Amino acid sequence: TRVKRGYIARRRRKKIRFFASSFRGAHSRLTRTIAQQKIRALVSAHRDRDRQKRDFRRLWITRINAAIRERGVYYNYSKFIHDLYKRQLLLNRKILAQIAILNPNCIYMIYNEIIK
Amino acid sequence: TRFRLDNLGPQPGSRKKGKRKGRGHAAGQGGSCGFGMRGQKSRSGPGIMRGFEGGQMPLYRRIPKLRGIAGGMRAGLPKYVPINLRDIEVAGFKEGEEVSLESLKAKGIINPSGRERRLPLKILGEGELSTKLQIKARAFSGSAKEKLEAAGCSVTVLPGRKKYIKESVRKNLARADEYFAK
RNA sequence: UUCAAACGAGGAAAGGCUUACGGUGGAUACCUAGGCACCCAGAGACGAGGAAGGGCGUAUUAAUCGACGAAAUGCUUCGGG
RNA sequence: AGACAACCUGGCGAACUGAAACAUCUUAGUAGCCAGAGGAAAAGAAAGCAAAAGCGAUUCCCGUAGUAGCGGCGAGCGAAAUGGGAGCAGCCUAAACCGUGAAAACGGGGUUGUGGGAGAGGCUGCUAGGCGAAUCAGUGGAGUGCGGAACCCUAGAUGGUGAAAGUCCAGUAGCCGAAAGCAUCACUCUGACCCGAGUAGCAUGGGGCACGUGGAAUCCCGUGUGAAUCAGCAAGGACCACCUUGCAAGGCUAAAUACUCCUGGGUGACCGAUAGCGAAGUAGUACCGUGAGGGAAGGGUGAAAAGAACCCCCAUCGGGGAGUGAAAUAGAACAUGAAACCGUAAGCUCUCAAGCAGUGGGAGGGGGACCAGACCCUGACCGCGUGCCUGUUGAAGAAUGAGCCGGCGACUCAUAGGCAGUGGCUUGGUUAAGGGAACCCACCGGAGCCGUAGCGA
RNA sequence: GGCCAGUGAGACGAUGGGGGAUAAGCUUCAUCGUCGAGAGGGAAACAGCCCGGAUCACCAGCUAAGGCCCCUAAAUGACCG
RNA sequence: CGGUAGGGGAGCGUUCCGUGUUAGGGAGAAACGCGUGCGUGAGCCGCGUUGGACGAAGCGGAAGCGAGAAUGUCGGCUUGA
């Protein structure tokens, strides 16, 4: 019972190639190099999904800081966050920063009535 | 539900499905195939000598050899095909008509086959007989005589050995027994 | 609108990526025109009335392969169709 | 006389290897060469086994048994008898005596073991063949397939036929047949005298029997010695005694058994053109080598050549119309036609950039004959991100490996030992060979093996 | 105790010592950490130091080690030297 | 519920066999190339084009059964140009 391989090889290497078919140069069209590269692509994806969570937060913090410094001359992000928790107020950084963009009136309003 | 060539299958666990070994690292035992990393046991071919201690003197050649087995003296290969009185009682018969090589071989737990098949019986008192039988055998033990004469069994030793001697030996023994007579 | 400053789009390439259609090539699929292994019978030949194997021939017309041997793509006899 | 695949008989006869080195030993009397012959060959009708109980020429299988043993007692090597089968078959010859001198060279008399002799008193098969049942249409190349309606079968084995047929063909089950040739059946003993002689044995040197000289028998050999004749001789694992068994030094002999260059018939959880013989094509060819010798690759237009009349470009090649065809996106470089590699066309997009080429975020632009906060292609610019493998204390490594793409390409099988899982039996279990209208297979075969008593050399 | 593996080149750091020149990313032992076989964060980059042990998803939150002029998250915060 | 050597458990596919001369198939199978389905994955499943006749399951069985590395090997085609 001789068993030729035939079908089973490139039916998977097509699927391997389906990933890399946006890649630039040799990486897109060379079997074993595609196989080497796909892995690395997936690894960089998995790695950067966790970088995502901290990096968006880090952007938001900068946005909020930039927004809040335009009020009083000496008022600053660090103080602002502790002033939120002093009054018991569970707005997360995403919302705060995005309202700071899309409706600065509302940040003015939150800033006004947190101080007292 | 009726059995057909459609329906049949094995029971869970009987047919295991072995280890085709070296076919991907996910299947496990792959790329070197569970032999680690080089050295004598990794290579193809025969292993070593079995019992080899590495050039240290092997056990099987630094211990003396078991008294009798060290030049001649055939090991004590057993004679007599021992039954016991304890083992007889389970195979019951009232007037146990000659408990011998015949009757026991017909049923009673005794399958002599090889060189066993040329041997007589020794009867050995492991214990007790509730019934009175007639025994026909060679040689009995010290307990067996006591327990058989206590049970009341018509016990008969039957020899059939017949050693050739030599005329001179018979003359000498006839001299001996003759002297013992007077 | 005159000119001073800023800003620089929209057009515009050999090439890149994507899709399509070709070529090269003969993988995979399906296949057979040849092999392989067993079992049951046989057989293990032929040769000095010239062998095994070859050289050279032999058709109405070039080459080869088989057939055949100066009786040379065949001759005689007895059977079958 | 020479040739002849293997098998076989006889002659000579390695080494690598194993012993973790190596010389005894193992490889092995194997490979090789040489000679010889058959369908088998060799063996073979007891100077034999065995134990006081018996068996009756060989040879082969199961078994005893990996036991008894041998072994630098190391590596290893390793029997036989008892027991079960397959298959069976037994013969002839010389002298003592006779005749034609006399071992001048011829015929008769006899050849046997728990002692025997002579002497004196046409039949079938094979090699050619033959007869041989039963279906028709619809189905848009073609129908054996589909739905429909039938029929045969002692024929539903096979191969073909425009598409897969029990009923289209050749066939098959079933029956029939040979002039000619090959195989098969067709009373006494003088205890005179006989009992295989340079023989056995012996000394000494060896070989081989599982047995390495060892207590070393049995069998065969160079050297030297050198018997006896059934009141005998030899064997029974030195050797002597007593028992038992046999008759050495002359021959012949079918079967069961071994094998495949090969023929016929059947079969395949065999191959399908990088496979299967090296060899699917005029292959041991082409080619290489002084020579022995080495040794390739190259299958698939169609059902049918119907293989393209004619016209145009035109010296050819080739091409486009025409025509054939189911198809010429089947045109001979012709069937399905993947990848690398080479282009052509469209969407987006790079010329102040720095980059293992991706990845998360995503500016601006483009869609898909199907109205989506959905989806896809591109990707301004940002952040992250030291190719894979092997192999290392440690590898982005300037350590190793791969030009790329496709195929081929590696823990298997046989037999045993241990262990686990599962099943069957537990009146303990199980059969081996071997037998089966073959192979599997019901059903037999209990010979052996394992368990049922240890202790001790 | 049964069945069945790999390993038997280790490396650095802290301490206790030996050898060395109380030289070595040196060498050899003893006790423990990490790497080896361990990603992530701090250390510009940086196996072996510090923090912490990655089942997987979230465009939520709190913190360890370490930090808060800009490149680059957070005080161009405070008071005394 | 990090994980190299390494051990254990659970699976997917490949060709061939039983079931099966099954249904499914010249109103289009195998293949070949594409999918805004599915799964933890190996893989599965529907599509209409090219293709022109083979042949799924399910329950079971057996192996020439899975490739990227061997200065592997055969064939094709690059680079240097």
From Swiss-Prot, chain A:
Taxonomic superkingdom: Eukaryota
GO biological process, one term: translation
GO molecular function: rRNA binding; structural constituent of ribosome
Subunit structure: Component of the chloroplast large ribosomal subunit (LSU). Mature 70S chloroplast ribosomes of higher plants consist of a small (30S) and a large (50S) subunit. The 30S small subunit contains 1 molecule of ribosomal RNA (16S rRNA) and 24 different proteins. The 50S large subunit contains 3 rRNA molecules (23S, 5S and 4.5S rRNA) and 33 different proteins.
Gene Ontology annotations for the cellular component aspect, listed alphabetically: chloroplast; ribonucleoprotein complex; ribosome
Chief site of localization: plastid
Gene name per UniProt: rpl20
Purpose: Component of the chloroplast ribosome (chloro-ribosome), a dedicated translation machinery responsible for the synthesis of chloroplast genome-encoded proteins, including proteins of the transcription and translation machinery and components of the photosynthetic apparatus.
Family designation: Belongs to the bacterial ribosomal protein bL20 family.
Compartments reported by the entry: Plastid, Chloroplast
Keywords assigned: Chloroplast, Plastid, Ribonucleoprotein, Ribosomal protein, RNA-binding, rRNA-binding
Name recorded for this polypeptide: Large ribosomal subunit protein bL20c
The keyword rRNA-binding belongs to this UniProt entry's keyword annotation: yes
Any matching Pfam family: Ribosomal_L20
UniProt KW Chloroplast keyword: yes
UniProtKB/Swiss-Prot annotation, chain B:
Feature: compositional bias, Basic residues: 14-24
Keyword Transit peptide among UniProt keywords: yes
One Gene Ontology term, aspect cellular component: cytosolic large ribosomal subunit
BP GO annotations: translation
Annotated segments matching region Disordered: 1-43
Function: Component of the chloroplast ribosome (chloro-ribosome), a dedicated translation machinery responsible for the synthesis of chloroplast genome-encoded proteins, including proteins of the transcription and translation machinery and components of the photosynthetic apparatus.
Family the UniProt entry places it in: Belongs to the universal ribosomal protein uL15 family.
Protein name: Large ribosomal subunit protein uL15c
Organism field: Spinacia oleracea
Full-sequence portion shown in this chain: 78 to 259 of 271
